[PDB]
Amino acid sequence: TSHCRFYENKYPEIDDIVMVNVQQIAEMGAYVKLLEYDNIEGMILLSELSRRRIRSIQKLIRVGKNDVAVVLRVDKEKGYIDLSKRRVSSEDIIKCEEKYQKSKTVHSILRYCAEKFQIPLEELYKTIAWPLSRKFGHAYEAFKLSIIDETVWEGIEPPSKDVLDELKNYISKRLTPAVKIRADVEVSCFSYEGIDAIKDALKSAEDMSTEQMQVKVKLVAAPLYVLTTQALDKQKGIEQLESAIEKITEVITKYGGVCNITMPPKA
Amino acid sequence: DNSQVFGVARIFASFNDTFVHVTDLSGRETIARVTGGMKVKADRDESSPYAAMLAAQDVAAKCKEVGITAVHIKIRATGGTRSKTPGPGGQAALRALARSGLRIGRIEDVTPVPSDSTRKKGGRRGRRL
Amino acid sequence: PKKRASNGRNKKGRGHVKPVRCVNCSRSVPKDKAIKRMAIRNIVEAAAIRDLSEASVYAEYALPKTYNKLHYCISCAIHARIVRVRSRTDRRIRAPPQRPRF
Amino acid sequence: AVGKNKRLSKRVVDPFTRKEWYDIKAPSTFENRNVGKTLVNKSVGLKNASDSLKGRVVEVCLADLQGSEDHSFRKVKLRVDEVQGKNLLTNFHGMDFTTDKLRSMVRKWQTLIEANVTVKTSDDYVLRIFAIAFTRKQANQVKRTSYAQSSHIRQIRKVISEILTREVQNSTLAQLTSKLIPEVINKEIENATKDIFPLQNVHIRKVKLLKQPKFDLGSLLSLHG
Amino acid sequence: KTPVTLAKVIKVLGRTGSRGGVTQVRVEFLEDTTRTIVRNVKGPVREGDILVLMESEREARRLR
RNA sequence: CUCUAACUAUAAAAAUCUCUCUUCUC
Ligand SMILES: [Mg+2]
Ligand SMILES: [Mg+2]
Ligand SMILES: [Mg+2]
Ligand SMILES: [Mg+2]
Ligand SMILES: [Zn+2]
């Protein structure tokens, strides 16, 4: 029971960019289904099909696959779509490819949710997806902040709480990303004692490791020491590793040696 | 003189993507620049007469909205060094502006004709389509 | 073999003539081998005069005409049907096509 | 209709409810002093509109200005000079033909003569004027062309230059326009040239205003009520 | 705004088109006896039929 | 045996080609 379109209104809009699964081709193109809005079909017309000249009709369509699309005039009376494929900007295709995949994942999760709860998708998107899209602009960003922050479900009225529990479990299992921020610090020392200073630096860099983020400067060479961190929020590893670099500098400036940075902390 | 507040439509009709652009008598104040490529999708048909009717009808609607009732016409080809000949579409735009309510008078052509200068683009042997 | 006794140029006693660009393909051609048509037309087509006639201020307006010559390279003149590929004994007839309507 | 890239490198309003209307007045020289309307952005201090209006020029046919149709091919450009509030004046800025009449006169088998001259008015209005004449086929001519000699052309150009210089240097530009509208200089040129060569369709063209002394408030007031 | 108009053909202006399967005719509107317009037609017509035009003023020309 | 008025509006791409040449006298 797959239904319940991705965005606010059932019908396409003015100059909107979508994507289409194609099934059938009669004479003037293909009146074929959508999977960005409900499940309605639309005309792709041959004069407005491809950039090159239309040499073949079978190759460029690829029945049963995903394709770019733009709607010109929406038949907001009965459910018809006039649709285009040629006039989508090269930068526009890829950004819609995002929007489309963005929309698809939320449905992929809430499908599993409905099929396991046998509640029609319409009610689930009504109760959950639409308030999330209203609050955060995208249900995908709402899901990501749900992984981080629990307060995303406050102000929402699920049809049942077990839906929330299983959705949270499935999102923590499937939508799990902890980005590895890594850096390299070059020891350019020529000084008196360097290995004791390095041990002190490693201890002072490793005792700082928190419960959630643990920093281990691993060895791959003498000058080049590698700093690996698991940034849970993609914004704390930077400050951790900057503090680490400051502490390395505090170490090196007085024993006699010198060190330099080769790569700073990067995601 | 029954208070026909006047305008100048100034259709510029090229061999592609004609223009309709109604402005005041001095020409300083624009009203509904809206053009030929505004309302057609092919980008090949921008010169087509249908583009002319569509552009003309919407600019006439804006003309009634603002208040202009009577219009003088400045028909202009590309002119200059290019082809001196009015665009295929613009004539249809003239017809539409005649039709849709607007009163018309004082038809003029203002195609810029040069006095033989600015060597025309194309080389000696010219376009060799 | 000399195709045309008049050499197909119409210069005949001038040395050299200034060139003029073709109107379609912009090929420069001597201003005499520069097949040329008086494109005189009413600014509005006769098919649409009536709409103008009964929906216009200035009762009995002039309805002016637009004037311009057209200069073609002979390639365009032949392809765009301005000039036909006539027969031999019919080449030496220079009178225009019998005043199209009279 | 789309195919956009929007290389940009909604606070929308109704830009025409925020606008005023103003009247146009022609000088006392012509018959119908009223010209028409003009839309203007609303006059606010710090860019008062009356600053913007002074300098506007409007191209108007002489047929409307005179009612008659024989002035159809003429064309006068009037410059906005004085603003009175909801109503503004105009002074003469230039004269010209409709291109279509010019082309209708320009025919084959009759050479055209042009006379160009820069002349200073009686008051200060530094002008440039042009004159166009065509040889006239005689009343009995079987000769298929009506060409004029080069010497005849030189003499005719000199005559027309002298007549134009006289007419402009006589009177002020207000009186000059009052001479222009009856096109009396045309009959004068034909008078002084009909002995040399017939010269059909003599016409004074492209009266171009180049310089103006300061403002001349009083005369402008005299030209409008 | 459904201006479905009717025009009785008053004269047939030959047959055009690369296929040759289209016919251009002069049609005079059933109402407004004044106006006539030239338009294309697909399928056989003879002097007196009533073309059902959605659109009125799109006067097409000879077609290649 | 009296005369000089009409008019429109197309172009994408297409390379190459192995033989075998043979009488007119009544
Ligand atoms: Mg070719
Ligand atoms: Mg010699
Ligand atoms: Mg020739
Ligand atoms: Mg090979
Ligand atoms: Zn050419």
Which residues of C line the annotated binding site?
Answer: 8, 22, 25, 33, 73, 76
Q: Does B65 touch chain C (CB under 8 A)?
A: no
CA to C1' distance (Å), from D216 to F7: 51
A15/A17 Cα distance (integer angstroms): 7
C26 HSE (CA, 13 A, CB side) = 13
Q: Closest Cα partner for D128 from D203, D209, D57?
A: D209
Long-range contacts of D28-32 (CB under 8 A, 24+ apart): D28/D222, D28/D223, D28/D224, D28/D225, D29/D92, D29/D174, D29/D177, D29/D178, D29/D181, D29/D223, D30/D62, D30/D65, D30/D66, D30/D181, D31/D65, D31/D66, D31/D67, D32/B1, D32/D64, D32/D65, D32/D66, D32/D67
What are the C-alpha distances in Å from B99 to residues A60, B49, C62?
44, 14, 19
- Inter-residue contact A224 to A185 (CB < 8 Å): yes
A32 HSE (CA, 13 A, CB side) = 27
Q: Closest Cα partner for A106 from A72, A74, A130, A75?
A: A130
Helix A139-148 / helix A161-174 crossing angle, nearest 10 deg: 90
E13/D24 Cα distance (integer angstroms): 51
Nearest chain C residue to D104 by CA: give it: C67
Architecture of domain A179-261: 2-Layer Sandwich (3.30)
Which nt is closest to the CA of C97, judged by C1'?
F6
Question: Which tokens belong to B86?
Answer: 């009015």
Strand partners, D60: D76
The dihedral through the CA atoms of C34, C35, C38, C43 has a sign that is negative
Q: How many domains does chain B have?
A: 1
CA to C1' distance (Å), from C85 to F20: 39
Nearest chain E residue to C50 by CA: give it: E35
The reply to whether residue A72 touches residue B41, judged by beta carbons under 8 angstroms, is yes
Q: Provide the CATH number for the domain formed by A92-172 in this structure.
A: 1.10.150.190
What are the C-alpha distances in Å from E3 to residues B51, D90, E36?
20, 47, 17
Enumerate residues 48 to 77 of chain C having a beta carbon within 8 A of any beta carbon in chain D.
58, 62, 64-68
Helix A195-206 / helix A237-255 crossing angle, nearest 10 deg: 150
CA A53 to chain centre: 36
For E15, the domain range is: 2-64
The reply to whether residue B49 touches residue E57, judged by beta carbons under 8 angstroms, is no
A73/A93 Cα distance (integer angstroms): 19
Exposed e or buried b for every residue in D155-178, given b needs 16+ CB within 10 A? ebbebbbebbeebbeeebbbebbb
Closest ligand to residue C12's CA? 2
Question: Which tokens belong to A267?
Answer: 């995601």
Q: Closest Cα partner for A18 from A2, A41, A1?
A: A41
Question: Which tokens belong to C19?
Answer: 């060139």
Enumerate residues 6+ apart whose C-beta is below 8 A from A60: A49, A50, A54
Q: What is the CATH number of the domain that holds B32?
A: 3.30.420.80
Q: Closest Cα partner for B89 from B79, B75, B101, B105?
A: B75
DSSP B45: G
CA E34 to chain centre: 15
CA angle A130, A131, A136 (to 5 degrees): 100
Nearest chain A residue to D3 by CA: give it: A87
For B16, the domain range is: 3-129
The structure's method of determination equals cryo-EM
**DSSP structure string for A61-127:** T-TTSEEEEEEEEEETTTTEEEEESSSS-HHHHHHHHHHHHHHHHHHHHHHHHHHHHT--HHHHIII
Residue type at A217?
V
C64/C67 Cα distance (integer angstroms): 10
C-alpha distance from B96 to closest chain E C-alpha (Å): 9
Three-class SS of C50-63? HHHHCCECCCCCCC
DSSP SS3 for B84? coil
Question: Which tokens belong to B105?
Answer: 């008078």
Residues preceding gaps in chain D (C to N > 2.5 Å): 9
DSSP A47: G
Q: Closest Cα partner for B12 from B62, B73, B60, B96?
A: B73
Enumerate residues 6+ apart whose C-beta is below 8 A from C31: C17, C18, C19, C20, C71
Q: How many domains does chain E have?
A: 1
Q: Describe chain A by its helix, strand, coil percentages, rounded to 5.
A: 40, 20, 40
Residue type at A155?
G
Which nt is closest to the CA of C82, judged by C1'?
F8
- Inter-residue contact B71 to B8 (CB < 8 Å): yes
Tell me the residue length of chain E. Answer: 64
What are the C-alpha distances in Å from D122 to residues B60, D104, D125, D172?
47, 34, 8, 5
D25/D90 Cα distance (integer angstroms): 6
Name the H helices within D16-147. 49-53, 62-66, 99-105
Q: How far is the CA of C6 from the centre of ligand 2 (A)?
A: 18
Q: What is the CATH number of the domain that holds E22?
A: 2.40.50.140
Q: Which residue has the tokens 């063209």?
A: D205
Q: How far is the CA of A191 from the centre of ligand 1 (A)?
A: 82
- What domains does chain C contain, in order, with CATH numbers? 1-97 (3.30.1740.20)
Helix D173-180 / helix D150-170 crossing angle, nearest 10 deg: 130
The CATH number of A16-91, from 2.40.170.20, 2.40.50.140, 3.40.50.970, 3.30.1360.120, is 2.40.50.140
Give the domain ranges of chain A. 16-91, 92-172, 179-261
Three-class SS of chain E? CCCCEEEEEEEEEEEECCCCCEEEEEEEECCCCCCEEEEEEECCCCCCCEEEECCCCCCCCCCC
CA E58 to chain centre: 10
DSSP SS3 for A150? helix
- Inter-residue contact C51 to B95 (CB < 8 Å): yes
A43/A30 Cα distance (integer angstroms): 6
Q: Closest Cα partner for A88 from A10, A20, A35, A8?
A: A20
Q: Closest Cα partner for A132 from A98, A109, A162?
A: A109
- Inter-residue contact B47 to B61 (CB < 8 Å): no
Question: Which tokens belong to E63?
Answer: 């077609």
A172/A30 Cα distance (integer angstroms): 40
CA to C1' distance (Å), from C2 to F24: 40
CA dihedral C56, D70, C43, D94 (to 10 degrees): -100
DSSP SS3 for A48? helix
A123/A146 Cα distance (integer angstroms): 20
Contacts of C68 in chain B (CB under 8 A): 84-85
Burial of B102 (0-12, 13-18, 19+ CB in 10 A): buried
CA A212 to chain centre: 23
CA C79 to chain centre: 14
